[PDB]
Amino acid sequence: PFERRHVEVLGSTMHYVETGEGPPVLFLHGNPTSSYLWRNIIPHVADHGRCIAPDLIGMGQSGKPDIDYRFADHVRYLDAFIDALGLDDVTLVVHDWGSALGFHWARRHPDRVKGIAFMEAIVRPMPSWDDFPPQARELFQALRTPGVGEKMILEQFIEKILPGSVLRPLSEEEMDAYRAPFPTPESRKPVLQWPRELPIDGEPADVVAIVEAYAEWLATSDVPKLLFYAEPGALISPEQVEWCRENLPNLEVVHVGPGLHFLQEDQPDAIGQAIADWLQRLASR
- 261 in active site: yes
Closest CA to 35 of 65, 79, 1: 1
**DSSP summary character for residue 76:** H
> In angstroms, how far is CA 227 from the centroid of its own chain?
13
Computed from CA positions of residues 245, 136, 150, 183, in that sequence, does the dihedral angle turn out positive or negative? Answer: negative
Burial class of residue 97 (count of CB atoms within 10 Å of its CB; 0-12, 13-18, 19+): buried
Return the beta strands (E) in the chain as ranges: 3-9, 12-19, 24-28, 50-54, 90-96, 113-121, 225-232, 251-259
- 18 in active site: no
- 203 in active site: no
The answer to whether 11 and 37 have CB atoms below 8 angstroms apart is: no
The residue from 18, 55, 73, 120 that is catalytic is 120
The residue from 44, 48, 261, 266 that is catalytic is 261
Closest CA to 118 of 39, 230, 197, 15: 230
The answer to whether 226 and 118 have CB atoms below 8 angstroms apart is: yes
The domain locations on the chain are 3-284
Computed from CA positions of residues 162, 187, 132, 245, in that sequence, does the dihedral angle turn out positive or negative? Answer: negative
Query: Measured between alpha carbons, how far is 209 from 215 in angstroms, rounded to an integer?
Result: 10
Structure-solving method: X-ray
- List, in sequence order, every residue forming a beta bridge with 223; answer none if it has no partner: none
Residue 249 sits at φ, ψ, to 5 deg, of -60, 150
Query: Resolution of the coordinates in A?
Result: 1.7
The residue from 18, 55, 73, 96 that is catalytic is 96
Closest CA to 82 of 115, 116, 109: 109
- The domain defined by 3-284 folds into Rossmann fold (3.40.50)
Measure Cα distances from 74 to 30, 83, 231 in Å.
Answer: 11, 14, 30
